[PDB]
Amino acid sequence: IHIGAIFDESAKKDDEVFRTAVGDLNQNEEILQTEKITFSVTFVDGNNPFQAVQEACELMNQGILALVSSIGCTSAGSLQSLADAMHIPHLFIQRSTAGTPRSGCGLTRSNRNDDYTLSVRPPVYLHDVILRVVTEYAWQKFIIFYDSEYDIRGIQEFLDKVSQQGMDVALQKVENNINKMITTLFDTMRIEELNRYRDTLRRAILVMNPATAKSFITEVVETNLVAFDCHWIIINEEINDVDVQELVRRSIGRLTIIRQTFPVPQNISQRCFRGNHRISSTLCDPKDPFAQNMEISNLYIYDTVLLLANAFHKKLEDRKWHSMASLSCIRKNSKPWQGGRSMLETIKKGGVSGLTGELEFGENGGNPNVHFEILGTNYGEELGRGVRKLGCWNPVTGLNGSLTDKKLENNMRGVVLRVVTVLEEPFVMVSENVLGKPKKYQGFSIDVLDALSNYLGFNYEIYVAPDHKYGSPQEDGTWNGLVGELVFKRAD
Amino acid sequence: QAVQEACELMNQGILALVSSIGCTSAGSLQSLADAMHIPHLFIQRSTAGTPRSGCGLTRSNRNDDYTLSVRPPVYLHDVILRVVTEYAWQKFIIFYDSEYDIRGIQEFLDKVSQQGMDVALQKVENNINKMITTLFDTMRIEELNRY
């Protein structure tokens, strides 16, 4: 057996994962019982699709039955085109772009061939999770903050799902120099712009890498830009207990954080045991020095090599096994290989149990199984920053507990009223008199109305009735004056 | 296939390469030019003249870029930004076809949100002669009025 894997220069840790899989599989009592794996794991710049294809074709020249990668999409699309040309399965693991919430590659790819790509990381569910959370809170106006690497192409349908609820959601790139945005908000804004955003910043979702969220939250708290009744959300795949607790500690106001995991038993032995076989502690046991150095792709590469081992074992059991045929690139004898289509027909229609829990594939080309968890706090300084779990969700079994508390709509608040008046002293006097800008009003009835507004949250604007009379019935029965405005429903 | 034929041209021998090709192929020819130092020149096309966008290639900044993009990068959404700033629309809706790269409206909102404006969105498809006309039957009249 020979296997080829093409990894980004940052993914070099996945070499040790591949060697871990080989060391386990060369001792596994159930899988590849007659065989041993040989490997030529190769590192390339994940931004260079040509070099990735070149090394993949060198591995094919060495002879391989299936292809593996853990690389940037910019190369993955050309590895997919190579798989379309040669009909070689391409088990692809994406890596997060500086930790941005993941999005599919969206690259142009030929429709004239079956897709040999096998995304071992699941499709993005984050947008449906956000939509459901927002619906359960029943929000209507808020801002989504994301890093400059964020890309809605993976979640294109999210836009219509939100828009059909009528939401006025603002989307804004947070600059990498986060202070540039925050100081822009702090120094340049008039009172109206500041109130506009502070009412907006009552609800926000940080869809960004956790370090950027930490820095933004820190500087916002130093600038006190969180409104006193705000409730924010954070969501990423690349979040842990330490990230949740640091984000809560740095924040003030109410905070929500959404994070990913796998639907698996938590005990280390049940992380490691798989049938009679056991996964090496290097990946399954958090005590291992390498486990403290792991990155997300290191969870998937092991299950990928295990999947290839299971596929080869099945091909041996069916006696469909074939020689390690060498295949060549950039020659007009290069043609799709039937052994590779049979390898896809084996790998794409099966699965394994591994570090990801249970890994399986279909003509969707992607792992269906994933799990998500949400935590937060209750604000008010009698409770403040104490983290509680809200609950969990997964597409395999649905809701566990609840994703969130239900409903966050502030009572009576957000009301705006149009009010009509007549300038009778001392009840209503014009204070500031300027031509352009609207004028200010001071008087006994304004005092009473403010003593109501501050108690119930009324916003209002005032305009003088044009006819200047309180009014009487007329001969036709219509009312002139201030009562007229209330009869024709022109003012509230 | 593009890389194969470009390297067959290099086998025949060429002083420069020109292409008018899809973005992933363009990026593969670009990294080919970066590896072989043979010059490449890139032209872009789109379905039925749908609004273009930049290919979004994360091309490695470690070296000079051996592809000269003859068509310029796309800044249409910066024109939308400036027009909306001229009209000062406080609330509006944005429509996008099946082909437009929605990163452009993402960057539009990124730049609009410095002020902040209320925005709705909707997908659009060429079946408008049936898709929009069916709304009179399938929407509520309340929904139709709000639309």
Side-chain angles (χ1 to χ4, degrees), chain A residues 298-332:
Chain A
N298 305 155
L299 299 160
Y300 295 88
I301 282 292
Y302 180 94
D303 294 3
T304 306
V305 181
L306 180 64
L307 176 61
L308 292 188
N310 277 259
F312 297 152
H313 187 76
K314 179 55 174 165
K315 197 176 183 183
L316 287 157
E317 283 190 347
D318 288 3
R319 303 177 179 263
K320 291 169 182 164
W321 195 248
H322 278 68
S323 59
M324 301 184 297
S326 179
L327 294 172
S328 65
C329 296
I330 312 187
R331 269 143 285 198
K332 294 195 174 187

Short mmCIF file of all heavy atoms in Angstrom, two decimals, chain A residues 298-332:
data_model
loop_
_atom_site.label_atom_id
_atom_site.label_comp_id
_atom_site.label_asym_id
_atom_site.label_seq_id
_atom_site.Cartn_x
_atom_site.Cartn_y
_atom_site.Cartn_z
N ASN A 298 -5.62 18.19 12.75
CA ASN A 298 -5.02 16.98 13.32
C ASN A 298 -6.06 15.99 13.82
O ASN A 298 -5.74 14.80 13.96
CB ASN A 298 -4.07 17.35 14.46
CG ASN A 298 -3.01 18.35 14.04
OD1 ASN A 298 -2.48 19.09 14.87
ND2 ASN A 298 -2.69 18.37 12.75
N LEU A 299 -7.28 16.44 14.10
CA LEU A 299 -8.36 15.51 14.44
C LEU A 299 -8.82 14.72 13.22
O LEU A 299 -9.20 13.55 13.34
CB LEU A 299 -9.53 16.28 15.05
CG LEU A 299 -9.25 17.05 16.34
CD1 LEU A 299 -10.31 18.12 16.57
CD2 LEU A 299 -9.18 16.10 17.53
N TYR A 300 -8.80 15.34 12.04
CA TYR A 300 -9.43 14.77 10.85
C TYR A 300 -8.48 13.90 10.03
O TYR A 300 -8.93 12.92 9.43
CB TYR A 300 -9.99 15.89 9.97
CG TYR A 300 -11.12 16.66 10.61
CD1 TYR A 300 -10.87 17.76 11.42
CD2 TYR A 300 -12.44 16.30 10.39
CE1 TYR A 300 -11.91 18.46 12.01
CE2 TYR A 300 -13.49 17.00 10.96
CZ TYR A 300 -13.21 18.08 11.78
OH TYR A 300 -14.24 18.79 12.34
N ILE A 301 -7.19 14.24 9.97
CA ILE A 301 -6.25 13.47 9.15
C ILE A 301 -6.16 12.03 9.62
O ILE A 301 -6.05 11.09 8.81
CB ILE A 301 -4.88 14.17 9.14
CG1 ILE A 301 -4.88 15.37 8.20
CG2 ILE A 301 -3.77 13.19 8.76
CD1 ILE A 301 -5.00 14.98 6.74
N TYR A 302 -6.18 11.81 10.94
CA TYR A 302 -6.15 10.45 11.47
C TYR A 302 -7.36 9.65 11.00
O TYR A 302 -7.22 8.51 10.53
CB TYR A 302 -6.07 10.49 13.00
CG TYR A 302 -6.03 9.13 13.66
CD1 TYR A 302 -4.81 8.54 13.99
CD2 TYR A 302 -7.19 8.43 13.96
CE1 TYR A 302 -4.76 7.30 14.60
CE2 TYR A 302 -7.15 7.18 14.55
CZ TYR A 302 -5.93 6.62 14.87
OH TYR A 302 -5.88 5.39 15.48
N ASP A 303 -8.56 10.22 11.14
CA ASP A 303 -9.76 9.55 10.65
C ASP A 303 -9.74 9.38 9.14
O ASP A 303 -10.33 8.43 8.61
CB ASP A 303 -11.01 10.32 11.08
CG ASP A 303 -11.20 10.31 12.58
OD1 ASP A 303 -10.34 9.75 13.29
OD2 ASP A 303 -12.22 10.85 13.06
N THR A 304 -9.01 10.24 8.42
CA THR A 304 -8.91 10.11 6.97
C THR A 304 -8.05 8.91 6.59
O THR A 304 -8.40 8.13 5.70
CB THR A 304 -8.34 11.40 6.38
OG1 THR A 304 -9.13 12.52 6.80
CG2 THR A 304 -8.32 11.34 4.86
N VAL A 305 -6.91 8.76 7.26
CA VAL A 305 -6.06 7.60 7.01
C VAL A 305 -6.75 6.32 7.47
O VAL A 305 -6.63 5.27 6.82
CB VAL A 305 -4.69 7.78 7.71
CG1 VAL A 305 -3.79 6.59 7.43
CG2 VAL A 305 -4.03 9.07 7.25
N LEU A 306 -7.50 6.38 8.57
CA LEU A 306 -8.31 5.23 8.99
C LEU A 306 -9.38 4.88 7.96
O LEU A 306 -9.63 3.70 7.71
CB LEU A 306 -8.94 5.52 10.35
CG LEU A 306 -9.82 4.41 10.94
CD1 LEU A 306 -8.99 3.16 11.22
CD2 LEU A 306 -10.52 4.88 12.20
N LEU A 307 -10.02 5.89 7.37
CA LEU A 307 -10.99 5.65 6.30
C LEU A 307 -10.34 4.98 5.10
O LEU A 307 -10.90 4.04 4.53
CB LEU A 307 -11.65 6.97 5.90
CG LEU A 307 -12.63 6.90 4.73
CD1 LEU A 307 -13.79 5.97 5.05
CD2 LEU A 307 -13.15 8.29 4.38
N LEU A 308 -9.18 5.49 4.67
CA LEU A 308 -8.46 4.84 3.57
C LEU A 308 -8.08 3.40 3.91
O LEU A 308 -8.17 2.51 3.06
CB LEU A 308 -7.21 5.65 3.22
CG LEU A 308 -7.42 7.02 2.57
CD1 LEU A 308 -6.09 7.57 2.11
CD2 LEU A 308 -8.41 6.93 1.42
N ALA A 309 -7.65 3.16 5.15
CA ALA A 309 -7.33 1.80 5.58
C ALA A 309 -8.55 0.88 5.54
O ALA A 309 -8.46 -0.27 5.09
CB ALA A 309 -6.73 1.82 6.98
N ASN A 310 -9.70 1.38 5.98
CA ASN A 310 -10.93 0.60 5.91
C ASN A 310 -11.35 0.34 4.47
O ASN A 310 -11.82 -0.76 4.14
CB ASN A 310 -12.05 1.32 6.66
CG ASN A 310 -12.00 1.06 8.15
OD1 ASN A 310 -12.76 0.24 8.68
ND2 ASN A 310 -11.11 1.76 8.85
N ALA A 311 -11.19 1.33 3.59
CA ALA A 311 -11.53 1.14 2.19
C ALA A 311 -10.63 0.11 1.53
O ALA A 311 -11.10 -0.74 0.76
CB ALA A 311 -11.44 2.48 1.45
N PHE A 312 -9.33 0.17 1.81
CA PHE A 312 -8.41 -0.85 1.30
C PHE A 312 -8.74 -2.24 1.86
O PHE A 312 -8.66 -3.23 1.13
CB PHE A 312 -6.97 -0.47 1.63
CG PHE A 312 -6.51 0.80 0.99
CD1 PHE A 312 -5.53 1.58 1.59
CD2 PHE A 312 -7.04 1.22 -0.22
CE1 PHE A 312 -5.11 2.76 1.00
CE2 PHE A 312 -6.62 2.40 -0.81
CZ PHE A 312 -5.65 3.17 -0.20
N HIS A 313 -9.09 -2.32 3.14
CA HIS A 313 -9.49 -3.60 3.72
C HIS A 313 -10.75 -4.15 3.05
O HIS A 313 -10.83 -5.36 2.78
CB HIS A 313 -9.72 -3.45 5.22
CG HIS A 313 -9.98 -4.74 5.93
ND1 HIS A 313 -8.99 -5.65 6.21
CD2 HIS A 313 -11.13 -5.27 6.41
CE1 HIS A 313 -9.51 -6.69 6.84
NE2 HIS A 313 -10.81 -6.49 6.97
N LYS A 314 -11.74 -3.30 2.78
CA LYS A 314 -12.93 -3.73 2.05
C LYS A 314 -12.59 -4.18 0.64
O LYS A 314 -13.12 -5.19 0.16
CB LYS A 314 -13.96 -2.60 2.03
CG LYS A 314 -15.24 -2.93 1.28
CD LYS A 314 -15.88 -4.20 1.82
CE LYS A 314 -17.23 -4.45 1.18
NZ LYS A 314 -17.71 -5.84 1.41
N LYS A 315 -11.73 -3.44 -0.06
CA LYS A 315 -11.31 -3.82 -1.40
C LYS A 315 -10.57 -5.16 -1.40
O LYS A 315 -10.68 -5.93 -2.36
CB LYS A 315 -10.43 -2.72 -2.00
CG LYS A 315 -10.25 -2.80 -3.50
CD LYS A 315 -9.45 -1.60 -4.01
CE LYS A 315 -9.33 -1.61 -5.52
NZ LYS A 315 -8.49 -0.49 -6.02
N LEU A 316 -9.80 -5.44 -0.35
CA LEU A 316 -9.16 -6.74 -0.21
C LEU A 316 -10.17 -7.84 0.07
O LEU A 316 -10.08 -8.94 -0.50
CB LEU A 316 -8.10 -6.69 0.89
CG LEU A 316 -6.82 -5.92 0.56
CD1 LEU A 316 -6.15 -5.45 1.84
CD2 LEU A 316 -5.88 -6.78 -0.27
N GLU A 317 -11.14 -7.58 0.95
CA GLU A 317 -12.17 -8.57 1.25
C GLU A 317 -13.00 -8.90 0.01
O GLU A 317 -13.34 -10.06 -0.22
CB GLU A 317 -13.07 -8.07 2.38
CG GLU A 317 -12.44 -8.18 3.76
CD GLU A 317 -13.44 -7.90 4.87
OE1 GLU A 317 -14.54 -7.40 4.58
OE2 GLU A 317 -13.11 -8.18 6.05
N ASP A 318 -13.33 -7.89 -0.79
CA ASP A 318 -14.00 -8.13 -2.06
C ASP A 318 -13.08 -8.72 -3.12
O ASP A 318 -13.55 -9.06 -4.20
CB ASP A 318 -14.63 -6.83 -2.58
CG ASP A 318 -15.84 -6.41 -1.78
OD1 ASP A 318 -16.17 -7.09 -0.78
OD2 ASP A 318 -16.48 -5.40 -2.15
N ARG A 319 -11.78 -8.82 -2.83
CA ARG A 319 -10.75 -9.25 -3.78
C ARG A 319 -10.70 -8.35 -5.02
O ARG A 319 -10.24 -8.78 -6.08
CB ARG A 319 -10.95 -10.71 -4.20
CG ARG A 319 -10.95 -11.68 -3.03
CD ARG A 319 -11.21 -13.11 -3.47
NE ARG A 319 -11.19 -14.04 -2.35
CZ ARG A 319 -10.14 -14.77 -2.01
NH1 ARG A 319 -8.99 -14.69 -2.66
NH2 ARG A 319 -10.24 -15.60 -0.97
N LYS A 320 -11.16 -7.11 -4.89
CA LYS A 320 -11.04 -6.10 -5.93
C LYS A 320 -9.67 -5.44 -5.97
O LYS A 320 -9.46 -4.53 -6.78
CB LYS A 320 -12.12 -5.03 -5.75
CG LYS A 320 -13.53 -5.52 -6.03
CD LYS A 320 -14.57 -4.51 -5.57
CE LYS A 320 -15.98 -5.03 -5.81
NZ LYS A 320 -17.00 -4.26 -5.04
N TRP A 321 -8.74 -5.88 -5.12
CA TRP A 321 -7.44 -5.23 -4.98
C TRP A 321 -6.68 -5.21 -6.30
O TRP A 321 -6.81 -6.11 -7.14
CB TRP A 321 -6.61 -5.93 -3.91
CG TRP A 321 -5.43 -5.14 -3.44
CD1 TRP A 321 -4.11 -5.44 -3.64
CD2 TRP A 321 -5.45 -3.93 -2.69
NE1 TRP A 321 -3.32 -4.49 -3.07
CE2 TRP A 321 -4.12 -3.54 -2.47
CE3 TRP A 321 -6.48 -3.12 -2.18
CZ2 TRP A 321 -3.77 -2.39 -1.77
CZ3 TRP A 321 -6.13 -1.98 -1.48
CH2 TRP A 321 -4.79 -1.63 -1.28
N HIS A 322 -5.87 -4.17 -6.47
CA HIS A 322 -5.11 -3.93 -7.69
C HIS A 322 -3.72 -3.44 -7.33
O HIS A 322 -3.48 -2.98 -6.21
CB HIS A 322 -5.81 -2.92 -8.61
CG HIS A 322 -6.91 -3.52 -9.44
ND1 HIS A 322 -8.08 -4.00 -8.90
CD2 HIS A 322 -7.00 -3.72 -10.78
CE1 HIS A 322 -8.85 -4.46 -9.87
NE2 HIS A 322 -8.22 -4.30 -11.02
N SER A 323 -2.80 -3.56 -8.28
CA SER A 323 -1.45 -3.05 -8.09
C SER A 323 -1.44 -1.53 -7.93
O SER A 323 -2.38 -0.83 -8.30
CB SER A 323 -0.56 -3.45 -9.26
OG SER A 323 -1.07 -2.95 -10.49
N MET A 324 -0.34 -1.04 -7.35
CA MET A 324 -0.12 0.39 -7.13
C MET A 324 0.31 1.07 -8.44
O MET A 324 1.45 1.50 -8.62
CB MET A 324 0.92 0.60 -6.03
CG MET A 324 0.53 -0.02 -4.70
SD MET A 324 1.72 0.33 -3.39
CE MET A 324 3.18 -0.47 -4.03
N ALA A 325 -0.64 1.13 -9.37
CA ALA A 325 -0.34 1.61 -10.72
C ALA A 325 0.18 3.04 -10.69
O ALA A 325 -0.44 3.94 -10.10
CB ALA A 325 -1.59 1.52 -11.59
N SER A 326 1.33 3.26 -11.33
CA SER A 326 1.85 4.60 -11.54
C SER A 326 1.02 5.35 -12.58
O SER A 326 0.66 4.79 -13.62
CB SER A 326 3.31 4.53 -11.99
OG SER A 326 3.84 5.82 -12.21
N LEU A 327 0.73 6.61 -12.30
CA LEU A 327 0.00 7.48 -13.21
C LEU A 327 0.78 8.77 -13.42
O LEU A 327 1.40 9.29 -12.49
CB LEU A 327 -1.40 7.80 -12.67
CG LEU A 327 -2.37 6.62 -12.56
CD1 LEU A 327 -3.64 7.03 -11.83
CD2 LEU A 327 -2.70 6.07 -13.95
N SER A 328 0.74 9.28 -14.65
CA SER A 328 1.57 10.40 -15.07
C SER A 328 0.69 11.58 -15.48
O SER A 328 -0.44 11.41 -15.93
CB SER A 328 2.49 10.01 -16.23
OG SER A 328 1.75 9.70 -17.39
N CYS A 329 1.24 12.78 -15.33
CA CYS A 329 0.54 14.03 -15.60
C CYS A 329 1.24 14.81 -16.71
O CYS A 329 2.44 14.64 -16.95
CB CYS A 329 0.42 14.90 -14.35
SG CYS A 329 -0.56 14.14 -13.04
N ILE A 330 0.46 15.66 -17.38
CA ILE A 330 0.91 16.49 -18.50
C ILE A 330 1.52 15.60 -19.57
O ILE A 330 2.67 15.78 -19.99
CB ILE A 330 1.88 17.59 -18.04
CG1 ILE A 330 1.32 18.30 -16.81
CG2 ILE A 330 2.10 18.62 -19.14
CD1 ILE A 330 2.13 19.50 -16.39
N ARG A 331 0.75 14.60 -19.99
CA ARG A 331 1.01 13.82 -21.19
C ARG A 331 -0.34 13.44 -21.77
O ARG A 331 -1.30 13.21 -21.03
CB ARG A 331 1.86 12.58 -20.90
CG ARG A 331 3.36 12.80 -21.03
CD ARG A 331 4.14 12.02 -19.99
NE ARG A 331 4.04 12.62 -18.66
CZ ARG A 331 4.87 12.36 -17.66
NH1 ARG A 331 5.84 11.48 -17.78
NH2 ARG A 331 4.71 13.00 -16.50
N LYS A 332 -0.41 13.37 -23.10
CA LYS A 332 -1.70 13.12 -23.73
C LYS A 332 -2.13 11.66 -23.66
O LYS A 332 -3.14 11.30 -24.27
CB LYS A 332 -1.68 13.60 -25.18
CG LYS A 332 -1.52 15.11 -25.32
CD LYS A 332 -1.85 15.59 -26.72
CE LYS A 332 -1.83 17.11 -26.79
NZ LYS A 332 -2.30 17.62 -28.11
#
